[PDB]
C-alpha cells in the first residue's frame, strides 16, 4: 500500500504526512505499513495527466486524493486524475469538488467525494418549503448540466407530495438580457422564486429584476449557495435566504477524514480471499484491476464516525449523505445565521428574519388574480357575433317588452 495524493500547495504535504503517520501509529493494515506520495497541480492540463502516471501509477498506488486549487476554473483539478485512474478502475477520493457532473457514475466509473454536490441543497429547499407551508413556486434554472440536474432532483422530490411546480422557465447560460422571461413570470399567482444559476447570471437576473419591482413586499426569494458568493453579493435584494456548508472550503478536516476512511477500508480488504497488486507502470499493462470494483464496493459501504467532519456515510452512487447546512439571511447587506439543517429536518434559531420589503410577517405565497380570461365561439343562439359600430359602442336593441339586451 503506497497511497498517494494530489494536493494544492506544499504546506498541506506535511499535514498529509502527519495524518498518515498518525493513522499508521493508531490502527491500519500490516502490508508495507503505509506511505505517501505528493504532486502539485501544474496548470498545463494535458501535461498534468501524464505527470499523474509518472508519479502515481509508476509507484503502484491504491487510491488517489485530488483537491481543488484556488484557481477559478471549476474543472481544473478532478477531470484528468479521474479519467486516468478510471482507465485502470482504481478508485479516487475527491476532497472539495461540489460540481454535479461527477455524480453521474457512468463516465467517471470510480470517483468518491466527501462533500455533497449542490442538488442536495435542492433537497434542503424542499425541506425548508415544508416547514413554512409554501405550495407555489416559479423556480428559474440555468441550461447546463448543473441546472437540469437540480431541476430534475427537485421535481423527483416533489412528485411524492402529489403536487407540481408552477413554471420552470430557463435561460441560456451567460446571457446579457433576461427581462423577457422575468416579465413573463410576473402575471402569475405564485410568489416564491427558487433561482439557481451561476454567479454572473445571478447578478444579471438580480439587476434585471430590480427594475420590475419584484424585490418589494411579498416576494419570498430562495437562493442556494453559489449565487450569494463574491460578485452576486453586490446587487442582492435584502431578504434572500442563502444556504451554505459548515465545513466547506476547508482542507485539514477533509484530509484527516479521507485518510481515516481509506486506512480503515485498507485494514479490511487485506483480510479477504483473493488479493491482487496494483498495475505498476503507466505503459505496458492495459487490463483492469482484479480487485478494483471490489475495492470500490467495500469502500463505498463503510460507516465510520470518529473524525471532525460529522458522520460519514456514502450513498448509492458514492456521492455523500447526512451533511449539515447552515441557513443564513441578508439584512442590510450583512449575512446572519438564522438556523441549522441537521439532516432531513430543519431547526430554526432564536433570531428574527426580515423578508424583502421589510415587514416582519410570513407573506403568503398565493394570490387570487380575479381577472379570468374567457374564450367563446360563434355558434347558434348561444353566442351571437355581430360586426361592431365605428362609434365605439355596439348598439341599443330591445326585446318583446323592450328590455335591454346585454352586450360585451
Amino acid at each position: 500500500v503506497n497511497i498517494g495524493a494530489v494536493l494544492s500547495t506544499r504546506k498541506h504535504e506535511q499535514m498529509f504526512r502527519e495524518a498518515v503517520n498518525q493513522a499508521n501509529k493508531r490502527h491500519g493494515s500490516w502490508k508495507i505499513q503505509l506511505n505517501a506520495t505528493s504532486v502539485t497541480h501544474k496548470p498545463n492540463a494535458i501535461q498534468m495527466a501524464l505527470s499523474v502516471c509518472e508519479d502515481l501509477i509508476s509507484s503502484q498506488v491504491y487510491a488517489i486524493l485530488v483537491s481543488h486549487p484556488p484557481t477559478p476554473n471549476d474543472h481544473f483539478t478532478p477531470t484528468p486524475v479521474s479519467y486516468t485512474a478510471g482507465f485502470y478502475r482504481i478508485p479516487v477520493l475527491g476532497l472539495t469538488t461540489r460540481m454535479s457532473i461527477y455524480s453521474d457514475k457512468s463516465i467517471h466509473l470510480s470517483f468518491l467525494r466527501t462533500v455533497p454536490p449542490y442538488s442536495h441543497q435542492s433537497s434542503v429547499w424542499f425541506e425548508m418549503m415544508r416547514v413554512y407551508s409554501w405550495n407555489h413556486i416559479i423556480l428559474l434554472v440555468s441550461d447546463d448540466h448543473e441546472g437540469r440536474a437540480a431541476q430534475k432532483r427537485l421535481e423527483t422530490l416533489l412528485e411524492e407530495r402529489e403536487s407540481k411546480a408552477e413554471k420552470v422557465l430557463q435561460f441560456d447560460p451567460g446571457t446579457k438580457n433576461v427581462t423577457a422571461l422575468l416579465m413573463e413570470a410576473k402575471e402569475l399567482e405564485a410568489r416564491v422564486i427558487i433561482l439557481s444559476a451561476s454567479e454572473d447570471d445571478a447578478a444579471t437576473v438580480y439587476r434585471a429584476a430590480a427594475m420590475l419591482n419584484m424585490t418589494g413586499s411579498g416576494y419570498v426569494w430562495l437562493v442556494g449557495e453559489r449565487e450569494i458568493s463574491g460578485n452576486a453579493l453586490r446587487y442582492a435584494p435584502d431578504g434572500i435566504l442563502g444556504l451554505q456548508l459548515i465545513n466547506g472550503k476547508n482542507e485539514s478536516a477533509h484530509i484527516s477524514d479521507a485518510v481515516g476512511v481509506v486506512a480503515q477500508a485498507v485494514h479490511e480488504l487485506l483480510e479477504k480471499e483473493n488479493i491482487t497488486d496494483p498495475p505498476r507502470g503507466c505503459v505496458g499493462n492495459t487490463n483492469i484491476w482484479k480487485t478494483g470494483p471490489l475495492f470500490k464496493r467495500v469502500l463505498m459501504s463503510s460507516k465510520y464516525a470518529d473524525g471532525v467532519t460529522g458522520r460519514v456515510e456514502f450513498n448509492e452512487d458514492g456521492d455523500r449523505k447526512f451533511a449539515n447546512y447552515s441557513i443564513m439571511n441578508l439584512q442590510n447587506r450583512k449575512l446572519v445565521q438564522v438556523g441549522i439543517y441537521n439532516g432531513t429536518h430543519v431547526i430554526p434559531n432564536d433570531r428574527k428574519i426580515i423578508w424583502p420589503g421589510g415587514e416582519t410577517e410570513k407573506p403568503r405565497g398565493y394570490q387570487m388574480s380575479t381577472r379570468l380570461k374567457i374564450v367563446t365561439i360563434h355558434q347558434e343562439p348561444f353566442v351571437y357575433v355581430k360586426p361592431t359600430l365605428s362609434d365605439g359602442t355596439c348598439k341599443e336593441e330591445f326585446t318583446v317588452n323592450g328590455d335591454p339586451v346585454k352586450k360585451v
Binding site: F87, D144, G284, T286
Partner: protein
C-alpha cells in the same frame, strides 16, 4: 488537407497502402486535396495515447484523426474525448473502443461517434413490440449506471 488514420491492428492488419489508396482518381470531383498519414497502432495506454497523438500532431499539421480500436475497455472513448477538449482537432471513432456512446460530452469539444444511443435502442425495441401485438409487459432493471434515464 491532411487527416491521419489509426487502426486497431485486428481486422485489416495488412496492406496499409490500401487504406492509403483512398480515392485513387476521385470520388465526386474532390474540390480539396487531402492525404492520409495512416499509422498502425498497438496496445493503447493513456500516456502512450496522449504522447502518440501530440507528437503525431506536432508533425504534418494534423486534423480529424479517425481513431479505431480493437479491444473493449469502455474508457478509451472518455480519454479520447479528453484530448479533443484540449486540442482543437476533430476526432471520430469507428470500431470498438471509440464506439460506445457516452451520455453527455463537454460542450466545447469536437468528438463524434458511430454507434447508437440508449434512446434509439429503446425506440427500436418498442417498434418491435408494437409490430407483433405484444401490448403488455413489465420491464425489470438492476442498479446499473443509466437505469434512471432508460426508465424515464
Amino acid at each position: 488537407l491532411n487527416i491521419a488514420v489509426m487502426l486497431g491492428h485486428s481486422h485489416d492488419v495488412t496492406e496499409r497502402e490500401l487504406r492509403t489508396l483512398w480515392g485513387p482518381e476521385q470520388a465526386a470531383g474532390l474540390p480539396l486535396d487531402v492525404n492520409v498519414v495512416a499509422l498502425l497502432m498497438n496496445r493503447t495506454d493513456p500516456k502512450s495515447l496522449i504522447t502518440h497523438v501530440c507528437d503525431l500532431m506536432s508533425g504534418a499539421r494534423i486534423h480529424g484523426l479517425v481513431f479505431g480500436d480493437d479491444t473493449d475497455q469502455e474508457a478509451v472513448a472518455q480519454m479520447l474525448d479528453f484530448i479533443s477538449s484540449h486540442t482543437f482537432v476533430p476526432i471520430l471513432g469507428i470500431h470498438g473502443g471509440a464506439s460506445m456512446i457516452m451520455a453527455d460530452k463537454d460542450p466545447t469539444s469536437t468528438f463524434f461517434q458511430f454507434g447508437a444511443s440508449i434512446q434509439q435502442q429503446a425506440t427500436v425495441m418498442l417498434k418491435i413490440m408494437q409490430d407483433y401485438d405484444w401490448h403488455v409487459f413489465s420491464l425489470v432493471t438492476t442498479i446499473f449506471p443509466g437505469y434512471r434515464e432508460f426508465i424515464s
